């Protein structure tokens, strides 16, 4: 029990660190774009642009190196999820409808199981009734099924 909790905590910490690093990368890219749009052409601005580019490259390299560690806890995303997330929204209706379909399938399964159970119970009862000589195997049939 303690090992699973420790592994979960380590995975959460690693994912939080990755999230923070990627957020910093995104902020640096936003700053880079802002500087490019409002570039004055001064040598100091050029040096700042070079430093920002170097920092972005170093951050990307560090993220690639850390995320590729075989010992990292990071090591499924279906293509349908990628297709659904391309619609500019908050990702809930896909899960809602597909879980609704899942629940409908489960309810169908339970209802058909109950129906089949009553079917074979009634059939066993009547086979015992009109055919007492076959009563003994029928119960064994239940033992063979249940």
């Amino acid at each position: 029990m303690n090992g699973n909790s420790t592994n979960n905590e380590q995975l959460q910490q690693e994912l939080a660190t990755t999230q923070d690093q990627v957020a910093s990368i995104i902020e640096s890219f936003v700053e880079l774009g802002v500087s490019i749009y409002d570039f004055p052409g001064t040598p100091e601005a050029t040096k700042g642009m070079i430093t920002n580019l170097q920092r972005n490259v170093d951050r990307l390299y560090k993220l690639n190196v850390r995320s590729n560690d075989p010992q990292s806890s990071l090591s499924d995303i279906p293509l349908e999820v990628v297709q659904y997330i391309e619609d500019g929204r908050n990702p809930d209706i896909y899960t809602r409808e597909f879980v609704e379909a899942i629940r409908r399938s489960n309810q169908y399964q339970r209802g058909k199981m109950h129906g089949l159970k009553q079917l074979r119970d009634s059939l066993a009862d009547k086979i015992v009734d009109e055919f007492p000589e076959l009563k003994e195997p029928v119960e064994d049939i239940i033992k063979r099924t249940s």
């Binding site: 957020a23 995104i26 902020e27 936003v30 659904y84 997330i85 391309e86 619609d87 500019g88 929204r89 908050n90 990702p91 809930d92 209706i93 896909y94 809602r96």
Partner: peptide, 22 residues
């Protein structure tokens, strides 16, 4: 509980920027 929608756009709204088209 919460309003429901389709895609991942609202997961990036907290970050600075104007993601009008995705």
């Amino acid at each position: 509980a919460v309003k429901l929608r389709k895609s991942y756009k609202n997961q990036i709204a907290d970050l600075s920027g104007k993601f009008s088209t995705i």
